[PDB]
Amino acid sequence: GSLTEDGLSYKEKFVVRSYEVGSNKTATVETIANLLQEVGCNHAQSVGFATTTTMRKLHLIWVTARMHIEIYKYPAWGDVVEIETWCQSEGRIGTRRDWILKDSVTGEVTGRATSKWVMMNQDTRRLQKVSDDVRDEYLVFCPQEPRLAFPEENNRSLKKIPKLEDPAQYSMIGLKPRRADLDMNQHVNNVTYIGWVLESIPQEIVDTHELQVITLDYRRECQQDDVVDSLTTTTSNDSQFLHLLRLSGDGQEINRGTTLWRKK
Amino acid sequence: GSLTEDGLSYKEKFVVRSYEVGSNKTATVETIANLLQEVGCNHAQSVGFATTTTMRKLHLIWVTARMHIEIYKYPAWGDVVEIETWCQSEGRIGTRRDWILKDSVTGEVTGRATSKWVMMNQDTRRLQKVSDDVRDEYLVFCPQEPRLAFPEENNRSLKKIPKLEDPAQYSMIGLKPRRADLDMNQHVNNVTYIGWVLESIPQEIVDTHELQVITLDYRRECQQDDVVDSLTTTTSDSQFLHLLRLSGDGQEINRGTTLWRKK
Numbered sequence A: 001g002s003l004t005e006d007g008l009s010y011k012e013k014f015v016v017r018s019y020e021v022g023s024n025k026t027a028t029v030e031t032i033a034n035l036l037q038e039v040g041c042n043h044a045q046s047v048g049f050a051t052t053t054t055m056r057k058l059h060l061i062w063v064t065a066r067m068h069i070e071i072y073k074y075p076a077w078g079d080v081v082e083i084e085t086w087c088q089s090e091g092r093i094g095t096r097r098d099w100i101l102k103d104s105v106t107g108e109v110t111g112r113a114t115s116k117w118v119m120m121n122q123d124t125r126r127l128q129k130v131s132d133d134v135r136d137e138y139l140v141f142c143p144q145e146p147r148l149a150f151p152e153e154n155n156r157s158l159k160k161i162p163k164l165e166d167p168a169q170y171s172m173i174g175l176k177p178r179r180a181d182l183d184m185n186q187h188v189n190n191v192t193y194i195g196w197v198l199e200s201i202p203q204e205i206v207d208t209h210e211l212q213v214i215t216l217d218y219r220r221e222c223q224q225d226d227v228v229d230s231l232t233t234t235t236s237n238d239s240q241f242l243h244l245l246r247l248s249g250d251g252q253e254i255n256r257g258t259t260l261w262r263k264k
Numbered sequence B: 001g002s003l004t005e006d007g008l009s010y011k012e013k014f015v016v017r018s019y020e021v022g023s024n025k026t027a028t029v030e031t032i033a034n035l036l037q038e039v040g041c042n043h044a045q046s047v048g049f050a051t052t053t054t055m056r057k058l059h060l061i062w063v064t065a066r067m068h069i070e071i072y073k074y075p076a077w078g079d080v081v082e083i084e085t086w087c088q089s090e091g092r093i094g095t096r097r098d099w100i101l102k103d104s105v106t107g108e109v110t111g112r113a114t115s116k117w118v119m120m121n122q123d124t125r126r127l128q129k130v131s132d133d134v135r136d137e138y139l140v141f142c143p144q145e146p147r148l149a150f151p152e153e154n155n156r157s158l159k160k161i162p163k164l165e166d167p168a169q170y171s172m173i174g175l176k177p178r179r180a181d182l183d184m185n186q187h188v189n190n191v192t193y194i195g196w197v198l199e200s201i202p203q204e205i206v207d208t209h210e211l212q213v214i215t216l217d218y219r220r221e222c223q224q225d226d227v228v229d230s231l232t233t234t235t236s237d238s239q240f241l242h243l244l245r246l247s248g249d250g251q252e253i254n255r256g257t258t259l260w261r262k263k
């Protein structure tokens, strides 16, 4: 992996490993998300980092508020995927990270992703607008003119997701994180929520369709000892679903989202 | 990755990715096992496969009966691990696959593993013992003189594991496989059982110790709709006896032992 010539984006090639392919005989949505995270971490490392020394001082961290992924073609075991990632400031609202996924052999775009990140105090969990000092620290590593993975004036990455109404059409109850679902900082990995949302999609859809689009809003972190319920209702050749992740007990919302699936 | 000069073993280098590192700030036992599987798959592919066309006709598959892993040093995020793997016939009993893990920079052995594989009919689930026809087709890819990752005459990898007696000292109940725990053939992958066994190790041990040895016996496959209980009792460095069983009838799926060293 390496930063591109202008030092304003990073590119890396990844082989799809055997343990990364699912029932569909190709990489899963979760494998794609894992690869997006890995290329994002390597980009931040290549420029001396997520947190600047000013953020560490004030106990501030970047947290994902929204993730939007669209896949046109899933790579098979042994295929090489080339991913280009970059960051951009969004004024005082937060930061955005975008990705372009390509087939290494054909050079064609096989997927694209975008994510909204907000600033939060690590301890109190209180969100805050980006200060001017923090803004200038990461602006030197970002393109100045807007560069969007989803440029379109009325695309699907900026749609507001409604809250699922009870009764849900489908559900998967009592989902618990395992010790493997935790990262280096003992927190539940953002990829785990993608898996949990897909747990309540009916088996028939999983067997005959491929996920084309996924939009996921993050509302609350799930602790190691929390239990989650995954809820899904069809909202629609193509199937659409509205999703809701909530705590098994009090029903406190942790995530909401939408998925769009295409017939194999 | 590539086969070595004699074509009797395969070597590959792997970078440890960010999503592969755990609470310990290093690769997990599950990440190591995933890397062993990947290098094993690439070795079978490099020689045209690990079912031969004769096994395919008769509906026979190789199944793991025992897995034994020993880790001396866990790689950190971004570290490159070099793994060498090879196979060997064990008469009519089955096959063995061994691995040697090395640090790419220092060349030192950071871990080693061994596994016993038995022949089974994928439909009836019946053990069948290895035929003579299926032997001459895989012996051409195996070293002829014995080559053992664990050579020591009666060491840790060949110790019989006893069955845990109730009440268990520790337990983690209601463990269900997710759709991500299934492989390309819709089966629960063998790495998932390693995770489930480690779920009942006390948090105190996990936070202050590193796993040094793991021996896991496979008795029954867990289906997508099965629920499992993970049981652990200290038998002692800390040693544990483990048992995975179905949440309902208590039907055994796995038994094992772990040895942990203070960080």
Ligand SMILES: C[C@@H]1CCCCN1C(=O)c1cnccn1
Residues within 6 Å of the ligand: A022, A023, A024, A026, A027, A028, A029, A030, A074, A198, A206, A207, A209, A210, A211, B179, B180
């Ligand atoms: C059906 C699989 C199995 C795991 C659960 C969901 N899946 C995916 O993430 C996927 C993979 N490829 C295409 C579309 N979706």
Ligand SMILES: C[C@@H]1CCCCN1C(=O)c1cnccn1
Residues within 6 Å of the ligand: A179, A180, B022, B023, B024, B026, B027, B028, B029, B030, B074, B198, B206, B207, B209, B210, B211
């Ligand atoms: C404690 C971690 C966290 C995940 C569950 C078990 N662990 C390991 O697999 C491990 C064990 N020893 C050293 C490094 N990692």
